[PDB]
Write a protein that binds this DNA or RNA. Structure first.
Lengths: 98, 37, 78, 99, 108, 213, 110, 149, 133
RNA sequence: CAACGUGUUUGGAACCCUGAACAGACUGCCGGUGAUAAGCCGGAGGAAGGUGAGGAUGACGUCAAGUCAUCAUGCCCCUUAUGCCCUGGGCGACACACGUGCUACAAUGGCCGGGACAAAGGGUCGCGAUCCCGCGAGGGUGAGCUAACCCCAAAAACCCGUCCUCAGUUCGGAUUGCAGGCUGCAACUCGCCUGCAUGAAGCCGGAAUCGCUAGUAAUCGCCGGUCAGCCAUACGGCGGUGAAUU
């Protein structure tokens, strides 16, 4: 009944943070929908490289927004306290929706 | 051709809308030709 | 859809067209319209350096003012 | 840029938030012409006396240096400064992909 | 290049050009490449000056002459002398050797 | 010319610093917050240790945002020099850093860590050659001094480039010395570099230190 | 045939042939295939004289050959009168949708 | 550079012929392959309408009369330019054959490209028109200078 | 056209650049269907495209023998026809694998490296460069 | 993927896709050539074969190349001014010259109608679906979407019919006039776009000159950035059709 979203710029942090959230959620309660990787919001920027006039040879860097949807079925009180027990991940943005 | 802004190919090149390149083909159209027979 | 008028020019209308007729009186803000209650007044349009006296006929109605005053002093042997 | 122009954008922004909602919520009522069409010309006179509070006049410079041009708006920084805040591990996620 | 010759293009950088300057350009360059019979397309003569009383560094007058000729390539010569006139005469000599290099290499 | 190593190796073996994950307008505002924190810490320690004797050498300022709480780690090599001995150094840091973040009054933990070996960390060693070179000491004595000073403290390979206007000159030079392998191209290799600008009296100098570890 | 004042088109397809007239309206050419319901694809040959009457009336209904030349040159003697920047650039034959004239203005430089 | 990797050449779409597929690639202008396809098969349905033989027979018999055996390669020795003829290969003569045939087929006016390619194609089949005359004027120039090698 | 299957018994996949194609290969007659149209009306007349569809079955001479109604999207029509073709090849591999030797000897089980090269900055079309004089 | 008739209603994870790990391609095997070696030529297997393709990557150094108008700064100089605020102009002038692009010069064409298939992006001060008014640009109403949901968004070249089927033309669209709309205190100098009007030059280009070795060239569209709106025919990308020659 709950959907939590994990967005980051870093794959070992969603991998390990979603790893331990799935670990705690499985070892504290019942069957829970797995982490579905929904695709990478990735976007590119072209930076004019030299300060003055060199229009060719620029620097286009790309930022990658990884994200995983992960769904827990049944709200149990010690399971809500299990998830809210873990203020663990270092930056990974977590969201809640129905 | 493509600069011919009174056409459909010209408005498609210009990224604009008028008679010849319509939004919602039900709505908005120039006069209709009647070759008939 | 609405004619644009600089408000000090509107106060020039409300000062001369209410009391009494007058003369060369200066304006800035070139972008104003004609406003046919201005006909017969002479408007001083800024041209980059000075203000020009331009008499306003009723034929000049329906435009903006700096079409009447050129800004480039191109005499020209280019 | 120069030291003056950053504070030009600063004091112009103070005039934005000074009566932003007041004057442009007034314009929310002017353009509503269901009641009348011909009148309110003078009321453009009341539209007039905000001058530097026109949001058309408000730029967005690079906050770290101040180049008015090539400001990638999603970062707030300029062109050339954005390299050395990618190349110094400072921007998160800037993985310099060359796909 | 008064008539019939290659198309002249001047560049004046840090230098207000006069009658005697570009007159000396077309007469020395043009009248020393007047015995040419060359249909060279374009001559770019870029005549900049620098230093001395103008700024830091010695008094310099530096000319580059570039010829975009049909006849086997493009050529350019940059010389830097104490005067404009010594610059343009010296580049005039260099481009005499480069054009005799081109004409003389068309042989047999 | 050449790409710089900390930019080039960002996918692997080098991690970012400002480690907080956000949305575009909030990305620009979070970058505001990051830059003012690094400003307050840098200007803070520069003032309160400029009155003090030696150089500090703050290498990294990592800023992390788990919850509405901001972990700030400061990686200097000589951390005993900072504090006013009960903890009052980091307390007053926490005061002046709280001065410019209290939009949402969220707590922040300023910590401080030790560099493992401070000569092997190119920002600190670049600060040392910056300090001695800002004093009237030649390029050679100070630069070789940095090299043997480094190799006593366990570094695999090193490259030092010092830019123009060395002791008395009006023509700029570049002077670089290398020892061991410094493969700038090998992506696995983990080279850490620094690029410090020394603001001297007769000009500006540029020091650029690559360290292959 | 011959149409209103003096002007007329060839012996070609009817819509195109009305296009050959001096100054008709092409959307109202298309309307003149719709109000009259004239067969456009058929040529100017094979046209009943009632269709020619309807054409001459509907072409009297809008301004045409000499009339628009008259009114546009009335806006040209207007464009001698009142000293405008359009008028000043027609004393000197420039372009008044305003191209950058530092290069290449040869609809009027000739 | 050394060489080109060998070749891959497929046959005709509907007749299974390696020549006619070469011709449909040569009539192609900027990717419109269905239209060049259309022009060629309208030319074949035109050639069934003109005479009553195999279009492979009138096509191959046409391009035999366009293909040269020798051509001018204006070569140089010591700075001296000889107009010496060198014997051209076979498939090279195919490509030149439908080259002159096709470009000369883009000159004869009057009607659509089916009639144009048909008319210059039968002119190649009868020794008239312009493609086989182009064969002659590129053939009577290498014949004119056999005093070189 | 109706008459569904709703299963994945003997499937085949294929993909040219942006054009994917999944096929199911039923032992039938030959009135075969791209997504819900005939092959002629979807492959838009008879270019080479329809012939690339007819190529792997005519390799084994199994034109009457099967009926391959196709589900496909992505890409444009030629590459969608090619992905149909290699879908037929990988489908025929997954019925009667002893057809490996005729199919692989021709270029039917392979895949071209058809991919649009990206624009390279300072160029115009990944090879096209602006001229200079 | 499937059903119900135009949902979150049912199943399935079987295809596709998303996205983490793994594997794979390394002259590994075979034959033949080569001082036995490096390799070289071929063959099998394999999705892919000899850097698989593209990118990022750019040594010591050169041009005392460019940048003191990104930023920092030696020295020098101005300081009731070489500083600062505000309104109007200007960077948009125009006898010419040089360069890069777009449109073309037509029947492989142009128009109309009806059909067909993409990718990648962007968007809560927004994107804006639906309905109505208007020939239209547009106006109102604003459901849905913080984005694999919704919207921008119609893809276009392409296919099937109608016409012109050789003309300065139903090619081409320049320039100008009248009438509008939008953005924004404000659109004259100097914004875009709609409706009508005109229909310039231009029948494939001298001398010379440039790009490209394959999903490339050519060709057809779509998106983004900056951005109130735009001068964008540019730039950064993304697909579609798709060659010839070495």
């Amino acid at each position: 009944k709950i959907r939590i979203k994990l967005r980051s710029y870093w794959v070992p942090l969603i991998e390990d943070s979603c790893k331990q959230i799935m670990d705690a959620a499985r070892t504290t309660n019942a069957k829970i929908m797995g982490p579905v990787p929904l695709p990478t919001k990735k976007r590119i920027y072209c930076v004019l490289k030299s300060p003055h006039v060199h229009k060719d040879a620029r620097f286009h860097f790309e930022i990658r927004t990884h994200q995983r949807l992960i769904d827990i079925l049944y709200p149990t009180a010690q399971t809500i306290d299990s998830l809210m027990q873990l203020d663990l991940p270092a930056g990974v943005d977590v969201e809640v929706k129905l | 051709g493509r600069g011919d802004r009174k056409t459909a190919k010209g408005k498609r090149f210009n990224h604009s809308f008028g008679n010849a390149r319509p939004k919602n083909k039900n709505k908005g159209r120039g006069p209709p030709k009647a070759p008939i027979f | 859809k609405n004619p644009f008028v600089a408000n000090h020019l509107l106060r020039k209308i409300e000062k001369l067209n209410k009391k009494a007729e007058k003369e060369i009186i200066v304006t800035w803000s070139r972008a104003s319209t004609i406003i046919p209650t201005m006909i017969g007044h002479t408007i001083a349009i800024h041209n980059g350096r000075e203000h020009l006296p331009i008499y306003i006929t009723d034929r000049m109605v329906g435009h903006k003012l700096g079409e009447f005053a050129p800004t480039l002093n191109f005499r020209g042997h280019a | 840029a120069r030291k003056s122009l950053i504070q030009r954008e600063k004091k112009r922004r103070n005039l934005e938030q000074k009566y932003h909602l007041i004057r442009r919520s007034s314009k929310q009522e002017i353009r509503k012409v269901t009641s009348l069409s011909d009148k309110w010309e003078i009321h453009g006179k009341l539209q007039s006396p905000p001058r530097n509070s026109a949001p058309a006049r408000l730029h967005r410079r690079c906050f770290l240096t101040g180049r008015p041009r090539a400001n990638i708006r999603d970062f707030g920084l300029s062109g050339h400064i954005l390299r050395e805040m990618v190349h110094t591990c400072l921007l998160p996620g800037a993985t310099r992909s060359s796909w | 290049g008064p008539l019939s010759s290659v198309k002249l293009i001047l560049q004046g950088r840090n230098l207000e050009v006069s009658d005697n300057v570009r007159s000396h350009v077309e007469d020395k360059v043009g009248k020393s490449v007047a015995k040419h019979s060359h249909l060279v397309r374009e001559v770019d003569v870029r005549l900049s000056a620098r230093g001395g009383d103008l700024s830091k560094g010695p008094k310099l007058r530096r000319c580059e002459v570039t010829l975009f000729t049909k006849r086997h390539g493009v050529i350019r010569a940059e010389e830097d002398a104490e005067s404009l006139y010594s610059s343009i005469d010296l580049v005039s000599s260099i481009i005499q050797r480069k054009l005799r290099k081109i004409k003389d290499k068309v042989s047999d | 010319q050449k790409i710089n190593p900390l930019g080039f190796r960002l996918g692997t073996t080098q991690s970012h610093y400002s480690l907080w994950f956000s949305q575009p307008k909030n990305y620009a505002e979070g970058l505001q917050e990051d830059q003012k924190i690094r400003d307050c810490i840098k200007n803070y320690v520069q003032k309160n240790t400029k009155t003090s004797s030696g150089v500090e050498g703050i290498a990294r300022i990592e800023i992390q945002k788990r919850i509405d709480l901001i972990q700030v780690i400061i990686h200097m090599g000589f951390p005993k020099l900072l504090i006013e001995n009960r903890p009052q150094g980091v307390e007053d840091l926490k005061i002046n850093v709280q001065k410019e973040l209290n939009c949402v009054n969220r707590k922040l933990n300023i910590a401080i860590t030790r560099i493992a070996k401070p000569y092997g960390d190119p920002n600190i060693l670049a600060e040392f050659i910056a300090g001695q070179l800002k004093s009237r000491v030649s390029f050679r004595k100070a630069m070789k001094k940095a090299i043997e000073l480094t190799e006593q403290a366990d570094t695999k390979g090193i490259q030092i480039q010092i830019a123009g206007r060395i002791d008395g000159k009006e023509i700029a030079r570049i002077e670089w010395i290398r020892e061991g392998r410094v493969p700038l191209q090998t992506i696995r290799a983990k080279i850490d570099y620094c690029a410090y600008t020394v603001r001297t009296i007769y000009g500006v100098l540029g020091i650029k230190i690559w360290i292959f570890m | 045939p011959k149409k209103g004042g003096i002007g007329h088109g060839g012996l070609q397809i009817e819509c195109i042939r009305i296009g050959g007239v001096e100054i008709p309206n092409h959307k109202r050419v298309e309307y003149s295939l719709q109000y009259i319901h004239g067969i456009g694809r058929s040529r100017s040959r094979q046209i009943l004289l009632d269709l020619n009457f309807d054409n001459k009336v509907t072409k009297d209904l809008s301004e045409e050959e000499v009339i628009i030349l008259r009114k546009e040159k009335r806006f040209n003697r207007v464009a001698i009168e009142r000293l405008k920047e359009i008028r000043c650039y027609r004393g000197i034959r420039h372009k008044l949708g305003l191209p950058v004239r530092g290069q290449r203005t040869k609809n009027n430089c000739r | 550079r050394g060489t080109v990797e060998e070749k891959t050449a497929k046959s005709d779409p509907i007749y299974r012929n390696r020549l006619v597929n070469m011709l449909v690639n040569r009539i192609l202008k900027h990717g419109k392959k269905s239209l060049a396809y259309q022009i060629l098969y309208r030319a074949v349905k035109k050639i069934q309408q003109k005479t009553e033989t195999n279009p492979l027979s009138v096509l191959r018999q046409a391009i035999r009369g366009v293909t040269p055996d020798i051509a001018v390669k204006a070569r140089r020795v010591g700075g001296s330019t000889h107009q010496v003829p060198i014997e051209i290969g076979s498939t090279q003569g195919k490509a030149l054959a439908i080259r002159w045939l096709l470009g000369a087929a883009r000159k004869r006016p009057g009607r659509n490209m089916a009639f144009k390619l048909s008319s210059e194609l039968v002119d190649a089949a009868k020794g008239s028109g312009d493609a086989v005359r182009k064969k002659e004027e590129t053939h009577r120039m290498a014949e004119a200078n056999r005093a070189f090698a | 056209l109706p008459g569904g299957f709703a299963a994945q018994t003997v499937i085949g996949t294929g993909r040219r650049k942006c054009a994917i194609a999944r096929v199911v290969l039923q032992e039938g007659t030959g009135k075969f269907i791209i997504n819900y149209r005939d092959a002629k009306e979807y492959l838009q007349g008879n270019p080479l495209w329809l012939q690339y569809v007819k190529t792997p079955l005519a390799t084994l001479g199994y034109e009457t023998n099967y009926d391959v109604f196709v589900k496909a999207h992505g890409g444009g029509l030629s590459g969608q026809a090619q992905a149909i073709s290699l879908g037929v090849a990988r489908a025929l591999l997954k019925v009667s694998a002893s057809h490996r030797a005729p199919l692989k000897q021709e270029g039917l089980l392979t895949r071209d490296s058809r991919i649009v090269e990206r624009k390279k900055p300072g160029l115009k079309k990944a090879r096209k460069a602006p001229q200079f004089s």
